[PDB]
Enzyme design. Structure first.
Site, PDB file in Angstrom:
ATOM      1  N   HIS A 182      53.575  42.420 -30.071  1.00  0.00           N
ATOM      2  CA  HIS A 182      54.623  41.482 -30.384  1.00  0.00           C
ATOM      3  C   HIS A 182      55.460  41.193 -29.140  1.00  0.00           C
ATOM      4  O   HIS A 182      56.635  41.579 -29.026  1.00  0.00           O
ATOM      5  CB  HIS A 182      55.486  42.016 -31.533  1.00  0.00           C
ATOM      6  CG  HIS A 182      56.349  40.973 -32.153  1.00  0.00           C
ATOM      7  ND1 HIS A 182      56.607  40.942 -33.501  1.00  0.00           N
ATOM      8  CD2 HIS A 182      57.001  39.911 -31.621  1.00  0.00           C
ATOM      9  CE1 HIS A 182      57.392  39.920 -33.776  1.00  0.00           C
ATOM     10  NE2 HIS A 182      57.655  39.284 -32.649  1.00  0.00           N
ATOM     11  N   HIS A 208      57.043  38.421 -26.543  1.00  0.00           N
ATOM     12  CA  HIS A 208      57.423  37.082 -26.127  1.00  0.00           C
ATOM     13  C   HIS A 208      57.399  37.025 -24.603  1.00  0.00           C
ATOM     14  O   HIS A 208      58.117  37.774 -23.930  1.00  0.00           O
ATOM     15  CB  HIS A 208      58.806  36.712 -26.629  1.00  0.00           C
ATOM     16  CG  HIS A 208      58.908  36.692 -28.114  1.00  0.00           C
ATOM     17  ND1 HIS A 208      59.046  35.530 -28.840  1.00  0.00           N
ATOM     18  CD2 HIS A 208      58.873  37.697 -29.008  1.00  0.00           C
ATOM     19  CE1 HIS A 208      59.098  35.824 -30.125  1.00  0.00           C
ATOM     20  NE2 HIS A 208      58.999  37.134 -30.257  1.00  0.00           N
ATOM     21  N   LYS A 257      49.825  33.072 -34.075  1.00  0.00           N
ATOM     22  CA  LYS A 257      51.098  33.501 -34.648  1.00  0.00           C
ATOM     23  C   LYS A 257      51.593  32.441 -35.592  1.00  0.00           C
ATOM     24  O   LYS A 257      51.754  31.282 -35.206  1.00  0.00           O
ATOM     25  CB  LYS A 257      52.138  33.681 -33.544  1.00  0.00           C
ATOM     26  CG  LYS A 257      53.565  33.870 -34.070  1.00  0.00           C
ATOM     27  CD  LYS A 257      53.711  35.219 -34.776  1.00  0.00           C
ATOM     28  CE  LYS A 257      55.146  35.504 -35.194  1.00  0.00           C
ATOM     29  NZ  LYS A 257      55.988  35.673 -34.027  1.00  0.00           N
ATOM     30  N   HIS A 307      54.928  31.506 -37.533  1.00  0.00           N
ATOM     31  CA  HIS A 307      56.346  31.810 -37.444  1.00  0.00           C
ATOM     32  C   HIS A 307      57.144  30.770 -38.224  1.00  0.00           C
ATOM     33  O   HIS A 307      56.871  29.566 -38.150  1.00  0.00           O
ATOM     34  CB  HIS A 307      56.770  31.811 -35.979  1.00  0.00           C
ATOM     35  CG  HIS A 307      58.109  32.423 -35.735  1.00  0.00           C
ATOM     36  ND1 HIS A 307      59.282  31.870 -36.191  1.00  0.00           N
ATOM     37  CD2 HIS A 307      58.464  33.537 -35.061  1.00  0.00           C
ATOM     38  CE1 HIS A 307      60.298  32.632 -35.837  1.00  0.00           C
ATOM     39  NE2 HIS A 307      59.829  33.644 -35.134  1.00  0.00           N
ATOM     40  N   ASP A 337      59.908  29.423 -37.720  1.00  0.00           N
ATOM     41  CA  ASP A 337      60.550  28.394 -36.903  1.00  0.00           C
ATOM     42  C   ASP A 337      59.647  27.172 -36.677  1.00  0.00           C
ATOM     43  O   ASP A 337      60.143  26.102 -36.339  1.00  0.00           O
ATOM     44  CB  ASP A 337      61.017  28.964 -35.568  1.00  0.00           C
ATOM     45  CG  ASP A 337      62.246  29.864 -35.680  1.00  0.00           C
ATOM     46  OD1 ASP A 337      62.624  30.331 -36.777  1.00  0.00           O
ATOM     47  OD2 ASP A 337      62.836  30.123 -34.617  1.00  0.00           O
ATOM     48  N   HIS A 354      55.286  35.914 -39.181  1.00  0.00           N
ATOM     49  CA  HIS A 354      56.723  36.025 -39.383  1.00  0.00           C
ATOM     50  C   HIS A 354      56.978  34.975 -40.453  1.00  0.00           C
ATOM     51  O   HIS A 354      56.930  33.744 -40.200  1.00  0.00           O
ATOM     52  CB  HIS A 354      57.470  35.721 -38.077  1.00  0.00           C
ATOM     53  CG  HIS A 354      58.956  35.490 -38.222  1.00  0.00           C
ATOM     54  ND1 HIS A 354      59.863  35.953 -37.286  1.00  0.00           N
ATOM     55  CD2 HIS A 354      59.687  34.830 -39.153  1.00  0.00           C
ATOM     56  CE1 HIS A 354      61.082  35.578 -37.637  1.00  0.00           C
ATOM     57  NE2 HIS A 354      61.003  34.907 -38.769  1.00  0.00           N
ATOM     58  N   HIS A 381      57.273  42.746 -37.823  1.00  0.00           N
ATOM     59  CA  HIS A 381      58.589  43.253 -38.257  1.00  0.00           C
ATOM     60  C   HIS A 381      58.700  43.244 -39.760  1.00  0.00           C
ATOM     61  O   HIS A 381      59.522  42.536 -40.338  1.00  0.00           O
ATOM     62  CB  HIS A 381      59.763  42.491 -37.634  1.00  0.00           C
ATOM     63  CG  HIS A 381      59.563  41.018 -37.544  1.00  0.00           C
ATOM     64  ND1 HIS A 381      59.428  40.208 -38.647  1.00  0.00           N
ATOM     65  CD2 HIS A 381      59.472  40.208 -36.468  1.00  0.00           C
ATOM     66  CE1 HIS A 381      59.268  38.958 -38.254  1.00  0.00           C
ATOM     67  NE2 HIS A 381      59.288  38.930 -36.933  1.00  0.00           N
ATOM     68  N   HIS A 407      71.474  32.659 -33.902  1.00  0.00           N
ATOM     69  CA  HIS A 407      71.309  31.514 -34.786  1.00  0.00           C
ATOM     70  C   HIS A 407      72.525  30.588 -34.764  1.00  0.00           C
ATOM     71  O   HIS A 407      72.595  29.654 -35.553  1.00  0.00           O
ATOM     72  CB  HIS A 407      71.020  32.004 -36.208  1.00  0.00           C
ATOM     73  CG  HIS A 407      69.618  32.486 -36.397  1.00  0.00           C
ATOM     74  ND1 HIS A 407      68.751  31.921 -37.311  1.00  0.00           N
ATOM     75  CD2 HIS A 407      68.922  33.462 -35.771  1.00  0.00           C
ATOM     76  CE1 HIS A 407      67.585  32.539 -37.245  1.00  0.00           C
ATOM     77  NE2 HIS A 407      67.661  33.479 -36.320  1.00  0.00           N
ATOM     78  N   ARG A 452      69.598  39.197 -44.820  1.00  0.00           N
ATOM     79  CA  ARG A 452      68.557  39.520 -43.842  1.00  0.00           C
ATOM     80  C   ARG A 452      68.709  40.892 -43.167  1.00  0.00           C
ATOM     81  O   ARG A 452      67.691  41.553 -42.881  1.00  0.00           O
ATOM     82  CB  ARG A 452      68.465  38.407 -42.783  1.00  0.00           C
ATOM     83  CG  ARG A 452      67.468  38.741 -41.673  1.00  0.00           C
ATOM     84  CD  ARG A 452      66.928  37.531 -40.950  1.00  0.00           C
ATOM     85  NE  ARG A 452      66.362  37.921 -39.663  1.00  0.00           N
ATOM     86  CZ  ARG A 452      65.828  37.081 -38.789  1.00  0.00           C
ATOM     87  NH1 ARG A 452      65.745  35.784 -39.056  1.00  0.00           N
ATOM     88  NH2 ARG A 452      65.376  37.548 -37.630  1.00  0.00           N
ATOM     89  N   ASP A 505      58.821  43.138 -29.989  1.00  0.00           N
ATOM     90  CA  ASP A 505      59.523  41.850 -30.126  1.00  0.00           C
ATOM     91  C   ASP A 505      60.281  41.525 -28.831  1.00  0.00           C
ATOM     92  O   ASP A 505      61.364  40.931 -28.856  1.00  0.00           O
ATOM     93  CB  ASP A 505      60.455  41.824 -31.346  1.00  0.00           C
ATOM     94  CG  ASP A 505      60.507  40.473 -32.020  1.00  0.00           C
ATOM     95  OD1 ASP A 505      60.104  39.487 -31.384  1.00  0.00           O
ATOM     96  OD2 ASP A 505      60.910  40.388 -33.207  1.00  0.00           O
TER      97      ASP A 505
HETATM   98 NI    NI Z   1      59.551  37.233 -35.734  1.00  0.00          NI
HETATM   99 NI    NI Z   2      59.104  37.817 -32.236  1.00  0.00          NI
HETATM  100  O   LIG Z   3      59.888  38.004 -34.032  1.00  0.00           O
END
Ligand code: NI
Ligand code: NI
Ligand SMILES: [O-]
Ligand code: NI
Ligand code: NI
Ligand SMILES: [O-]
Lengths: 122, 100, 570, 570, 100, 100
Positions: free
Chosen positions: D137, D139, D220, D222, D224, D249, D275, D323, D339, D363
């Site tokens: 995981h 980025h 992935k 996600h 978003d 995710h 996660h 966020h 959350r 992450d």
């Molecule tokens: Ni995530």
């Molecule tokens: Ni992530």
């Molecule tokens: O994530």
């Protein structure tokens, strides 16, 4: 004359979003026991099955809220929202796979919605 | 010492804070990187002292005031973030609007 | 539903009529137009618009009008306009400026700006986006200078040098085929665009021309190698054949001629006059008169920019030290006094403001600062607004005219001068995606993210060990565009047409993108965007007073500048 | 002659029945078996055993059962066992685990572990040796993250990103063929193994599949980008055809469905749930119920690991900042409270201990710490021992069962999940020689030496100007494995079968070792070593209480952790 | 803080000056790099204080004297140069023959 | 200054020692890298002072005691090594078991 570096001096007035598009108000209920939050640009008929509303009134529409914002429904919460019309080609693909083509195909969208248990097909 | 990359980098923050503190002590109004360094080092030293994240979120808003810094600096700093090793491991602290 | 403008600008960046302060200057830019459709703004994140079936199209393959990268909600500052748009990048080039998203459901989407499965997103809402700066007066002395340049938004270095050799320390020259080849190979490891200048000196054509054939992108005439009529003439004859630019640092000493003699040798041919004010070098005291001529493309270097209270003291001593001059030798003192002149430095501020000097540059490490070309451009514009007022051409209280005049000095005009504006120098469709994002509070001071060929090459970013990228220390760092073989695809080595035709890149194993220098010889001052003024500049040989249109050009030095002690740790 | 055990362990490292404390935790590992012959231990130095005609064979050429490298007297900690052995490496792979030396004169030498003229020696006596950590995981946001990872014993990064672009800052995604190609080229300069994930979003197959063909190693999904039923479905259909893994995710907002809807779209197909506890993202509040299902390979990310007194305050604020949420907007506060949940974070500790969550991950830089996957694994195991006691499965007072359960979470299980366990993820014969040496006092905190493809890539070592390598400052530094072209031979770029078949490495000029992703689609939870438990996990929608087998899973947060302020300068 | 390459480098000078000042305070005659560091940091701090280039050219010649440094050090240092951000931007200061 | 690679690196040690000394002064029990930094800088400064290698081998064992450091730190540090320029050039100092 105090200087805030990089500050804006915005013009007067207000910005009207989704100008010239039909608006529609509908009641929507979260019949589930977990919260549901709905973004500005999701085809409204394709939202979570457990939201109860007149699904036909969600076809070809989305929330009339600022781009990038969302409406929140707590468990058991019913409230009114305002929808606006989708633009461009008025086609939707993917998401919940209820449309996959023109939003004009209301009969097909509703058939699929009903078969899969999206609440509020009347 | 077995310094890892973060430990090496973060020495710089302490050093920049020491520099900025000397400048303050001789009566200078502090600038943007000076202010950021002082508050950041404060957070990291507070973690080392064993304070909680919540304590540092509060205290970080009282380290420098607007009369300690140049015009516009309070408004340039929306928040200051630092990660440090607390007694319970690495945690992130964000101090929001540190200088009123 | 309506959104008030304060809230709109906070969410999406400013829109039509809104103004933004540039850093801590008195300069305000106003959004001239906006390509968006209100309500269909693109944005990325949780519950945001650019999601599959929504603002992101889930149907089209990459080839089918889909972008590699969308910069959302950019405030563009460019010679072409100050305006709000999404910027779409594909294959490392800007392919669309307009409105990105999904034509399925959004109105007004530019047809080749589809956000699809293939699309990366950079949020530019609340940022100012400019073209990467083009520095055409670079001495290649110390490789650490590259990050310095990137950190202030510079993306192309044109100049010469082999490292800290005396020839290079004095002159932007990589001499001869072998040094040129060596430096082309070195360039493979420099994360910035590069073009190399050969030595514009010789009395026969072949020794000069062989540098062009070897891979030089232009020539530099410098007095330290003999800025004689012969060297001027042969270099321009080469340049006219080869379609490359010639830069000149003229004979300060007036040894073989005065300015009029240098102009006679130039004989109407196109030339780039470096540090035209003359503190950086040139016919004493009147070199700046070059900037009035139609065949001259005039640039300043940065340490005289703008005229401040420490400028003269600093420059007099710098000159004395660098030339090993002695305070007790009257010839040395006379030379220094003839070269460092408040009269011409003050006029230089005004000539910039009037569009008579067309370009900025650094003179990096040889009498100029590698990371201050952009910085000092805006400090100059700010000083001029304070001293001369808004220009007559302005409207609605904005400084847009001045902002376009000044941004052109370090973006499009140097590109045009060098013959590289087909590739770089502005935010236009069809050009290489060299883009700089700025937070307005740091505008012109410290770049946020520098995009090179459509991948981020440099960024102000924090702790690499942290949960998120914003915790301290936030500092300038090289990004993935500079790593491994990606450095080859994100940067351009600019070369002469002949070297390219002769296969020099293959011969040397160059893997970088190869840019062609062209269209340098039939341009002139008229082609300098927003800075196209020709006029008779008179410099009094006795007083050094500068006159334009019968009017003495003078202004005061300032004690303080913006974009200075509020920002810098040292 | 006999040697007492204290003296034996001091000289050769521990032997059968001896225990070693892991760093400053309460965890003890016990040597289960030992491959040596007492008296014929291998060692290197003046007057030592590995000398020509003695423990080093002087007859055989390299091809004839001779090693390139022998690690002497290693205490191996692996899912396969906790035991004492020499480790033999050849052609960059582990070829023997057993007893090295010279069959001329020593008893019990493993036949392909001859120390010969060709053999380098690393002394592992008194060290713990593990496989390199596999972080799935990642980025790719800041290249400085690689050294951070190496310093805590991580040797493979699986994830996505193009640098500090917003898409990458939020999601482990390198979108589309062009960005994938660019990042494969960048990877040539990263001294760690890498596999790249494409965007698992689309409603047509081709836009998703073309990423696999371009060189992605997986996908992935996600929220978003729209974690919709369509995107889930198409990504899994691609993955099933391509034999790559999909990570998810999920839709935290429950916008298009609740957990049961995401599971229905998955439709029994194999998937890696990132996660899984959900603070890092996923269906609020019940995403962690994924970890009970047979087709789910569940991982945690690291900032919730383990549950401490600062965890909630830290996470609530981190979420709000990231966020751009406002404390005075009730929808924002409700979202954050839905959350970030002490009930599920506390249960997550216990689910790890029970073998219900199979994997750890970082992450890195998008809500996780690049250099703390290994660290936090052991802090979790330690907390659980303190709170739940030795597990029932333990023997002789040792924590070996727990140690194997936990080491598997960041070594073999992520490798199996990703389809790369044929190459990496454990200390076994036939696998790539990615090995991490630890001093027990620094175990899980700071690696001593990180071996990549049989050459040291990273080490804690001192003054390069000193007479010897141990004087201060001792710090993490890149070693010769990372320099020049050796970076190509010591690291693997993992790629899809189709991209390899289609010649992508040749097309892009990739010089790194190319690893094939395979056998990802017919595995499940049962294949997770020591962490194979399936069960009905109930998460109360009102209270967020977690139940397994009718029993509420809860524990207290701790005020202090080991592997923390004793070790770190900041 | 948004540190650029020069800001990071120049922190070192301040640090070397701090080191050298401690050595001086405990009675050591300073060596070449120590002397250079002290004078250089002095210039940079003076710029931060808002002094002029001319003031610093003068003052820089009185920071250390020959009795503060080891034999030969005064003659090793022909001049010391530093660039720093003055109120009017970056300027170069050269201190000629700083130690008589 | 003409800093070579070692001189640049070793500035870090002095800085880490300064940090650790501040932490000690405000009453914290020191950790492993803090303790190592203090003793290392002590050795390097002692060389600069002109002490002998033998003097520093002795003195280095009395810079920090077990009550100055966290539990287990004395046993984590088997020896501390530093090279520094003595009056007679670079020499290696090893302090064995510095903290009893
Ligand atoms: Ni995530
Ligand atoms: Ni992530
Ligand atoms: O994530
Ligand atoms: Ni010049
Ligand atoms: Ni020059
Ligand atoms: O120059």
């Amino acid at each position: 004359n105090y200087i805030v570096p990089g500050e804006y001096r915005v013009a007067e007035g207000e910005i009207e979003i989704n100008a010239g598009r039909e608006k529609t108000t509908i009641r929507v209920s979260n019949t589930g026991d977990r919260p549901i939050q709905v973004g500005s640009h999701i085809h409204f008929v394709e939202v979570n099955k457990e939201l109860l509303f007149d699904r036909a009134e969600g076809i070809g529409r989305r929330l009339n809220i600022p781009s990038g914002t969302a409406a929140r429904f707590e468990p058991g919460e019913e409230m009114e929202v305002e929808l606006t019309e989708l633009g461009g080609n008025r086609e939707v693909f993917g998401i919940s796979d209820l449309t996959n083509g023109s939003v004009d195909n209301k009969e097909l969208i509703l058939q699929r919605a009903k078969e899969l248990g999206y609440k509020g097909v009347e | 010492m077995h310094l890892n990359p973060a430990e090496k980098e973060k020495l710089q923050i302490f050093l920049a804070s020491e520099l900025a503190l000397k400048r303050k002590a001789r009566g200078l109004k502090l600038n943007y990187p000076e202010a950021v360094a002082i508050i950041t080092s404060f957070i990291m030293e507070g973690a080392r002292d064993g304070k909680t994240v919540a304590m540092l979120m509060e205290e970080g808003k009282h380290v420098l005031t607007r009369d300690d810094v140049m015009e516009g600096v309070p408004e340039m700093i929306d928040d200051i973030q630092a990660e440090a090793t607390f007694p319970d491991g690495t945690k992130l602290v964000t101090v929001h609007n540190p200088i009123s | 539903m309506k959104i008030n403008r304060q809230q709109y600008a906070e969410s999406y960046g400013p829109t039509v009529g809104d103004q933004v302060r540039l850093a801590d200057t008195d300069l305000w830019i106003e959004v001239e137009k906006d390509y968006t459709t209100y309500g269909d703004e693109a944005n990325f994140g949780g519950g945001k618009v650019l999601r599959e079936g929504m603002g992101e199209n889930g149907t089209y393959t990459r080839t089918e009008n889909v972008l590699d990268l969308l910069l959302t909600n950019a405030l563009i500052l460019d010679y072409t306009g100050i305006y709000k748009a999404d910027i779409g990048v594909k294959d490392g080039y800007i392919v669309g400026i307009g409105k990105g998203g999904n034509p399925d459901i959004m109105d007004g989407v530019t047809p080749n700006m589809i956000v699809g499965t293939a699309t990366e997103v950079i949020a530019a809402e609340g940022k100012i986006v400019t073209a990467g700066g083009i520095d055409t007066h670079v001495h290649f002395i110390n490789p650490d200078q590259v990050d310095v340049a990137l950190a202030n938004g510079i993306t192309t270095l044109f100049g010469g040098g082999t490292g800290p050799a005396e020839g290079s320390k004095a002159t932007t020259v990589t001499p001869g085929p072998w040094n040129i080849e060596k430096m082309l190979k070195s360039t493979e490891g420099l994360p910035i665009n590069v073009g190399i200048l050969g030595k514009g000196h010789g009395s026969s054509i072949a020794p000069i021309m062989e540098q062009i054939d070897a891979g030089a992108a232009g020539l530099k005439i410098h007095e330290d190698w003999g800025a004689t009529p012969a060297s001027i003439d042969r270099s321009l004859t080469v340049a006219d054949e080869a379609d490359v630019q010639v830069a000149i640092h003229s004979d300060t000493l007036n040894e073989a001629g005065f300015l009029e003699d240098t102009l006679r040798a130039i004989n109407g041919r196109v030339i780039h006059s470096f540090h035209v004010e003359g503190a950086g070098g040139g016919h004493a005291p009147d070199i700046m008169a070059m900037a009035g001529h139609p065949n001259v493309l005039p640039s300043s270097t940065n340490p005289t920019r703008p005229f401040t209270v420490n400028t003269i003291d600093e420059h007099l001593d710098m000159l004395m030290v660098c030339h090993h001059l002695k305070q007790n030798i009257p010839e040395d003192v006379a030379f220094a006094d003839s070269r460092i002149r408040p009269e011409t430095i003050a006029a230089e501020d005004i000539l910039h403001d009037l569009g008579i000097i067309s370009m900025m540059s650094t003179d990096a490490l040889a009498m100029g600062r590698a990371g201050e070309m952009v910085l000092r451009t805006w400090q100059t514009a700010d000083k001029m607004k304070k001293q001369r007022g808004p220009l007559a051409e302005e409207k609605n209280g904005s400084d847009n005219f001045r902002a376009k005049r000044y941004v052109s000095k370090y973006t499009i005009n140097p590109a045009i001068a060098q013959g590289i504006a087909h590739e770089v120098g502005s935010i236009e469709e069809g050009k290489f995606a060299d883009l700089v994002l700025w937070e307005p509070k740091f505008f012109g001071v410290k770049a946020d993210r520098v995009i090179k060929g459509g991948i981020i090459a440099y960024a102000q970013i924090g702790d690499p060990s942290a949960s998120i990228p914003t915790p301290q220390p936030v500092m300038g760092r090289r990004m993935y565009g500079t790593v491994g073989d990606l450095i080859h695809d994100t940067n351009i080595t600019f070369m002469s047409k002949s070297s390219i035709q002769q296969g020099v890149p293959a011969k040397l194993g160059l893997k970088r993108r190869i840019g062609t220098v062209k269209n340098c010889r039939n341009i002139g001052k008229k082609d300098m965007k927003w800075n196209d003024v020709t006029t008779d500049i008179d410099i009094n040989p006795e007083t050094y007073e500068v006159k334009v249109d019968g009017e003495v050009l003078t202004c005061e030095p300032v004690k303080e500048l913006p974009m200075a002690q509020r920002y810098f740790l040292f």
